[model samples]
Target: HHHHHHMVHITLDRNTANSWLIISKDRRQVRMGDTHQNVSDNKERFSNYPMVLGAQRFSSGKMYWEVDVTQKEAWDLGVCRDSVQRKGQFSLSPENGFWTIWLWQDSYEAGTSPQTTLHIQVPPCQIGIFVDYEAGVVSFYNITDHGSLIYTFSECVFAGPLRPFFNVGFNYSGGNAAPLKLCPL
Candidate 1:
């Protein structure tokens, strides 16, 4: 077992967030806004995509963070390359520079080209994301019970710096109302 535990406090970067996705005052929690904010669109702004990134950048070593994805209709979180395109609708697959896990419609899945269903009897209220850039790995852990390995992406060739990515998924209704909070250490 790995003895080193890398716990990092991550803050949501509002500049990269969608106009509809709201970042909390403390910048730790990211929630789906009930109503979209009226803001001018830009190339860096995400219109179709509903994602937000953390301010921390990782190039080497191990890093970890936790997310509260409880009672949500849909949600996704993981790590992505800093160079990932911000405009338009795109897949959250590794090919598109996103390695993630999602919980939607009471079902859990990893972001494979063809997603693989993960059977988790009780949903993970707190999910942990662990990144090992040195070993070319990005792993997701269901932290509801200490931590259980959910999915791991190996052979990840890091082109540039990697940052925490998230999406309170597509439902604009009251479904995805709960805030996807990033827990601080």
Candidate 2:
């Protein structure tokens, strides 16, 4: 797949980020921070989770974007419905309006209700996300492994517009302090 034509600009949405997340000035990078930002409470802000959404929302066609996770110990990446709750704690699962994959403690997992475990040969320094909106598919690729497909969530029920999702998981004694970067096309 020559995804070049499908590449998109998915800048981080500051208003949607959790107070503990530090988004870069360009809104292209995010990471967990020790202090909570002086952001006001809002329906879009994630209060208890360290997550964020891309500014762009998609409801049609195919869109592709890449994220740089180099040296990051833990993170969650994929897409979520615009109406997903942000006020409280919740699991990251398809049933909860999340079609995401995450890495934690050297293990990878698909964000299904039961959480499917993934065994990958090459750790992805960079990951690619391709969403075929009309086809109801969201696929993830290991860019470091020759762009090999890692997983694909098929037959997704996107009840409404979807936005790129991000979660810089807990910073374990500074292990996951590195920023999760949005790569340029």
Candidate 3:
């Protein structure tokens, strides 16, 4: 096994976050807000989605990180190209530069063109994302299950830098309000 890359301490980028997201003071957690915050207009901000990006940018080498999804009923986590559309609603697929997996209504799926449904005996409380820039691979692991691999995207062609992606799906009547936290170290 290769072991040269370091785990990134990904802090949420407030500027790129959607108005409906409330980022923690330490910039390590994000959750859906009941109302849009009066945040300043930023071109990089997501206008129509409830998502945020990690401030760190990766263009080469292997990088790994984990997201705490405990008590979250709905969320999206992974990596996406830095240039992905942010001004409007777009397909959450790899073709649109988003390489992610999501959980909604207790259903887990990968954001592929046709979508890959994931069946797990135990829901993951913490998920690990591993990116091999040079190898053009992205892998998701269920940290709750002893870091067992959940899914992998290979043969990807990186066009630009990549950012850690997170989405605390729409807040539904107090449900799905649990924050998506970035694991430290």
lDDT per residue for candidate 1 within 1-185, as digits (tens), equals 24126888899888888888878799988777767866666665667767888989999999988899887889889999999989876888888888899987778999999998987766789988889999999888777866778888999977889999989887656677788898867
Candidate 3 stretches greater than 4 Å from native:
1-5
Tens-place lDDT digits, model 2, residues 1-185 = 46758999889999999988889999999988888877887788988878999999999999999999999888999999999999877999888899999998899999999999987899999999999999999999999999988999999999999999999888866888999999989
Models ranked on TM-score: 2, 3, 1
Candidate 2 Cα misplacement greater than 4 A, ranges:
none
Tell me each candidate's TM-score: 0.93, 0.97, 0.95
lDDT of each: 0.84, 0.91, 0.88
Backbone clash pairs for candidate 3 read: none
Count of steric clashes across candidates, in order: 0, 0, 0
Higher-ranked by lDDT: 2 or 3? 2
- Angstrom error of the Cα, residue 54, model 3: value is 0.6
Q: What TM-score does structure 1 among the candidates reach?
A: 0.93
- Give the higher-TM-score candidate: 1 or 3: 3
